Design a protein around this ligand. Structure first.
Ligand SMILES: *[C@@H]1O[C@H](CO)[C@@H](O[C@@H]2O[C@H](CO)[C@@H](O)[C@H](O)[C@H]2NC(C)=O)[C@H](O)[C@H]1NC(C)=O
Ligand SMILES: *[C@@H]1O[C@H](CO)[C@@H](O[C@@H]2O[C@H](CO)[C@@H](O)[C@H](O)[C@H]2NC(C)=O)[C@H](O)[C@H]1NC(C)=O
Ligand SMILES: *[C@@H]1O[C@H](CO)[C@@H](O[C@@H]2O[C@H](CO)[C@@H](O)[C@H](O)[C@H]2NC(C)=O)[C@H](O)[C@H]1NC(C)=O
Ligand SMILES: *[C@@H]1O[C@H](CO)[C@@H](O[C@@H]2O[C@H](CO)[C@@H](O)[C@H](O)[C@H]2NC(C)=O)[C@H](O)[C@H]1NC(C)=O
Ligand SMILES: *[C@@H]1O[C@H](CO)[C@@H](O[C@@H]2O[C@H](CO)[C@@H](O)[C@H](O)[C@H]2NC(C)=O)[C@H](O)[C@H]1NC(C)=O
Ligand SMILES: *[C@@H]1O[C@H](CO)[C@@H](O)[C@H](O)[C@H]1NC(C)=O
Lengths: 597, 97
């Protein structure tokens, strides 16, 4: 007859009913996702709304147990993850307005159009063609027109909606004792009551700003190299001591630089490893790839596939009429059912994406013993890191020369080493400054440090200060550039892409020390080494049961995220770069501009 | 069956643990708190009977298994149920045993 012994009694029934209803809803969602028809849409929406209403009723019922007297930590975690009102704490009118403006923002982002100044009946959407002109073209004026029009004709519609979404989210977060909407987002890395692993929401900003301070000595050199190379594709447009114009980076916003590799390849006379002709000329089918991936995963000591995975998963594209949107995902329908959905071909990128997906599948198979509310990653960034280190280790020449895709000798030279490391750097270390800057800007906006009459000015100031790119055309306070991004207009968090990049290399260097590696870090494999599988499974089976700063210690040996593994991974490229800029000027000045003339 | 088989129940709420070899068929509302509920579902008063959601697309570990438990016992009876042996053929014109 206590206020704790009722919590477990309620939690058992909730777990049972929730598992049942969630399996129903997820099965309906899969039935739609793999077979796009008309009745399947309503068959999925029905179960979806039923599960949502059930969760809402359980949430408004679980507010009878005060979190102040609960003593056990697992039941406390479950109740706290179930108790949060979230939205709907506002009045009804405000909630309707917020939902309407969110839907309007998503619709405006999805279906925007911009057409030529000399032929107004040939406009293209973003996805099929705009980020293709921005990715494949080599003409200055065309890229400039695209980058300017996509922000002038679609961005100008999002400002009077963002200026209200900010206020609505601020109120929704202040009604839950969070002081702003940014603290609500950082509330995922929050840890209380462990006596040795505490982590307050406010320390995340300090950790990010103190770990980003060690990457600049590498990003500056990479930037100087990219600039000294770009000054040969568009001469008389880049000055040797200025920033890079924000439209010559490779895509619409400059999030990834990977589309620049055709211009800045160090040794353009050595083709990097691409085992796609061997796979095709050795008659490899869509099932052999998954068999090889399962063999690799069972080599390290993780369990086999559940045998319910081979009969129901959709590995091949259904031909005649079964039109199905196949973006590769791994499903966790529950009750011991794991499925994979991807229209695979026989190439190398899908051969790596198979390992990436089986990473998520193994993760979801590991912690399937915890209660329902604790079936997730340790935080919002562990899942993709676990899924990524596998594909990172599954593309090394030592591994590919033992499966059979490569010749058994395949003489190696340091030139292909540099090629691969540089192609990796233009995607890994090329997005961290942009991510950190965008997150800092959104935090400073939500908190209230930037009055609404100084948004674009501070945004471009921070872009000139941190990332190192400058706008090609002045932008006044009528535009809205941040809202023209997908993650900003649909209300998605962005800080996870900065912690995943560090967790990935921390895990990699931690496991590569268990397999007793000898050479540099980027030539290691964790296959055929059983201790690595044990060290990884010691963290895989936890879920959200323990604070993430504990599951991070079980594999690495530290308490917080670090940045030394990344520089240890990129050391060779770092040296070769430091020996390449004897005549250039490493760094940038924030005064030059492509219109100040 | 597809779409669920809700005809196999299992009781998960009992005030006291079961003594060896006892069977209970009660369906009274298990009362967890301190307030009488007089036999209606709601808060802190739950119904103790729940049903498996058996479906064919399950993984080994949630599919329905059938169990048959045998028990053996000898209280005092001299000649009872016993297994069959081999009817030793009967020979003739030959003494032995
Ligand atoms: C994909 O969905 C469609 C629409 O529901 C299915 O088409 C019908 O499905 C019902 C359901 O059993 C069958 O009774 C009909 O015979 C189906 N019609 C046709 C023309 O096939 C379709 O079967 C689904 N795809 C698969 C592989 O089952
Ligand atoms: C309350 O906390 C205790 C320990 O803090 C939990 O006890 C664990 O229970 C699991 C499964 O019931 C066992 O596998 C562990 O061995 C137990 N730990 C210890 C140290 O004995 C208990 O589970 C918690 N309550 C609930 C409802 O989960
Ligand atoms: C969650 O929302 C409710 C309102 O929907 C908050 O207010 C409590 O609501 C209950 C239910 O009617 C009342 O009995 C309490 O008096 C209300 N005030 C309290 C508990 O201070 C509730 O506080 C919210 N909880 C959280 C954790 O945000
Ligand atoms: C992992 O270990 C296995 C077994 O030791 C290796 O498989 C053998 O590798 C040798 C080396 O050439 C071959 O001669 C054998 O034919 C292989 N056996 C089989 C059954 O294929 C495997 O190559 C190792 N993998 C790595 C990446 O080291
Ligand atoms: C790749 O390795 C070779 C040697 O294995 C390097 O070639 C030497 O580079 C030094 C640097 O000045 C010269 O002094 C030597 O004379 C070079 N050796 C020969 C045989 O010419 C080469 O520089 C390395 N390249 C990279 C990109 O790391
Ligand atoms: C996994 O499956 C393969 C073949 O299906 C079998 O040879 C192997 O022993 C299995 N391993 C485990 C751990 O189940």
């Amino acid at each position: 007859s206590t206020i704790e012994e009722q919590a477990k009694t309620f939690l058992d029934k909730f777990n049972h009913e929730a598992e049942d209803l969630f399996y129903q809803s997820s099965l309906a969602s899969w039935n739609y996702n793999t077979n796009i028809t008309e009745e399947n849409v309503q068959n999925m929406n029905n179960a979806g709304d039923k599960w949502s209403a059930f969760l809402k009723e359980q949430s408004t019922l679980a507010q009878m147990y005060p979190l102040q007297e609960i003593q056990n930590l697992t039941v406390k975690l479950q109740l706290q993850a179930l108790q949060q009102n979230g939205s709907s704490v506002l009045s009804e009118d405000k909630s309707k307005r917020l939902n309407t403006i969110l839907n309007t923002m998503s619709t405006i982002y999805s279906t925007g159009k911009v057409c030529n100044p000399d032929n107004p009946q040939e406009c293209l959407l973003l996805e099929p063609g705009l980020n293709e002109i921005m990715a494949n073209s080599l003409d200055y004026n065309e890229r400039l027109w695209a980058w300017e029009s996509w922000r002038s004709e679609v961005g100008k519609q999002l400002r009077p909606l963002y200026e209200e979404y900010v206020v609505l989210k601020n109120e929704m977060a202040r009604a839950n004792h969070y002081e702003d909407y940014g603290d609500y987002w950082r509330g995922d890395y929050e840890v209380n009551g462990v006596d040795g692993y505490d982590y307050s929401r406010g320390q995340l900003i300090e950790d990010v700003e103190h770990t980003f301070e060690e990457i600049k000595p590498l990003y500056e050199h990479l930037h100087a190299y990219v600039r000294a190379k770009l000054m040969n594709a568009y001469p008389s447009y880049i000055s040797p001591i200025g920033c890079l114009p924000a439209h010559l980076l490779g895509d619409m916003w400059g999030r990834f630089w990977t589309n620049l590799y055709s211009l800045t390849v160090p040794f353009g006379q050595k083709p990097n490893i691409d085992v796609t002709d061997a796979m095709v000329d050795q008659a490899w089918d869509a099932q052999r790839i998954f068999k090889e991936a399962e063999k690799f995963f069972v080599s390290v000591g993780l369990p086999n596939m559940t045998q319910g995975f081979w009969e129901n998963s959709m590995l091949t594209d259904p031909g005649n009429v079964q039109k199905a949107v196949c973006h590769p995902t791994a499903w966790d329908l529950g009750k011991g059912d794991f499925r994979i959905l991807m229209c695979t071909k026989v190439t190398m990128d899908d051969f790596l994406t198979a390992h990436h997906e089986m990473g998520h599948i193994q993760y979801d198979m590991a912690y399937a013993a915890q209660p329902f509310l604790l079936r997730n990653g340790a935080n919002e960034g562990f899942h993709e890191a676990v899924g990524e280190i596998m594909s990172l280790s599954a593309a090394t020449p030592k591994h590919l020369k033992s499966i059979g895709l490569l010749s058994p000798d395949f003489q190696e030279d340091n030139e292909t080493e540099i090629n691969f490391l540089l192609k990796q750097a233009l995607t890994i270390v090329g997005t961290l400054p942009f991510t950190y800057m965008l997150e800092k800007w959104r935090w400073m906006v939500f908190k209230g440090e930037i009055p609404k009459d100084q948004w674009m000015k501070k945004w471009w100031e921070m872009k000139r200060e941190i990332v190192g790119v400058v706008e090609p055309v002045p932008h006044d306070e009528t535009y809205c550039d941040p809202a023209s991004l997908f993650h900003v207009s649909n209300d998605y968090s962005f800080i996870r892409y900065y912690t995943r990049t560090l967790y990935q290399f921390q895990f990699q260097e931690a496991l590569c020390q268990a397999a007793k590696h000898e050479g540099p870090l980027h030539k290691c494999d964790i296959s055929n080494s059983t201790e690595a599988g044990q060290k990884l499974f010691n963290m895989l089976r936890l879920g959200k049961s323990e604070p993430w700063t504990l599951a991070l210690e079980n594999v690495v040996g530290a308490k917080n995220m670090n940045v030394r593994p990344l520089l240890n991974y990129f050391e060779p490229l770092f040296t070769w770069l430091k020996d390449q800029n004897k005549n250039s000027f490493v760094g940038w000045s924030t005064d030059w501009s492509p219109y100040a003339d | 069956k597809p779409s669920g088989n809700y005809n196999y129940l299992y009781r998960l709420f009992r005030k006291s643990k079961l003594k060896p070899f006892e069977r209970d068929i009660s369906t009274e509302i298990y009362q967890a708190g301190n307030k009488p509920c007089n036999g209606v579902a709601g808060s802190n008063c739950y119904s103790p009977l729940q049903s498996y959601g058996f479906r064919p697309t399950y993984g080994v570990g949630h599919q329905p298994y059938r169990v048959v438990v045998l028990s053996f016992e000898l209280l005092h009876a001299p000649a009872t149920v016993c297994g069959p042996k081999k009817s030793t053929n009967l020979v003739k014109n030959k003494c032995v045993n």
